[PDB]
Amino acid sequence: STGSATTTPIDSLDDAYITPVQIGTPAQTLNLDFDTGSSDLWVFSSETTASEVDGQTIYTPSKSTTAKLLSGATWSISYGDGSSSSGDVYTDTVSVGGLTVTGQAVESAKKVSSSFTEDSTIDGLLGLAFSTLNTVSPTQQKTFFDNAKASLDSPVFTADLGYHAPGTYNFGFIDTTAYTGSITYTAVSTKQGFWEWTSTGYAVGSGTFKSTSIDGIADTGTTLLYLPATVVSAYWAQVSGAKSSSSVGGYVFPCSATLPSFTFGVGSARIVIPGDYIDFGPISTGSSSCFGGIQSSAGIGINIFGDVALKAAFVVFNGATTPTLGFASK
């Protein structure tokens, strides 16, 4: 079996992407944030504190003839940005782009943090990291991809995120018309539960390539690219007027600037992030200071290849027995 679904930026900065998911019988379609950095499928629902819902589409398990409560199950999750949610659990039928899993754990939110409430375009998350991160207790639950893996023509999904444009998540096949050249594959460590790999280096603009190992995670659920302070400083040093601002929480730059590109290594291969992709716009409506899309990871604990990086490539999340990651230019 295979599945294929379009994913669409939620705003003009590509802060996140939403993908339509069918839950229950008859289908209830919700637009979820596919996150390779987490492993919970959770949705706004009929059980969510009413004050904390503001425009999202909710899932009503009582309207779904295939929904069954997972007795005793609960869940609570906190994300790297400080947001958080929690609630109880149903199993129900879930389909993505024609691909159907029966008995998927659909985690129903009783509580969401303000940031989720304030984002009326994201009805929940569908996590695609490794199931060892799933927060359901006392019985940990499997991700959508884990549940579907056996039935897929190939045990893989791919991420083809667009720059200011829709893109695609494919399950179970490689679309050889979606990229150029060849796919470079690279080793993955699952020991922290993430799609964790090691980039071979970077270059700034037309600068010479610097070979150095950069351990990090491929994470569709993070907007920006978070790298070590040395790398990030070398980049922003090439933008006149750029500076790191504690008040704003990161590197900012003159909105009048033309940004240089950033290249990251995948083995012997090279992925180029156009400079335009690093511009996340005024820090406030009307401001002439713009927020940078490459930021330091020194206050994270981990380097994050978020959408700023992943959307410059076609990305194969290979869930074979030995997981690997593959990157191609497009």
UniProtKB/Swiss-Prot annotation:
Domain Peptidase A1 per the UniProt entry, residue ranges: 17-328
Provenance organism: Cryphonectria parasitica (Chestnut blight fungus)
Keyword ATP-binding: no
Residues of the full protein shown: 90 to 419 of 419
GO biological process, one term: proteolysis
Bilayer-crossing regions: none
EC number from the UniProt entry: 3.4.23.22
Disulfide bond in keyword set: yes
Protein name from the UniProt record: Endothiapepsin
Residues annotated as catalytic: 35, 199
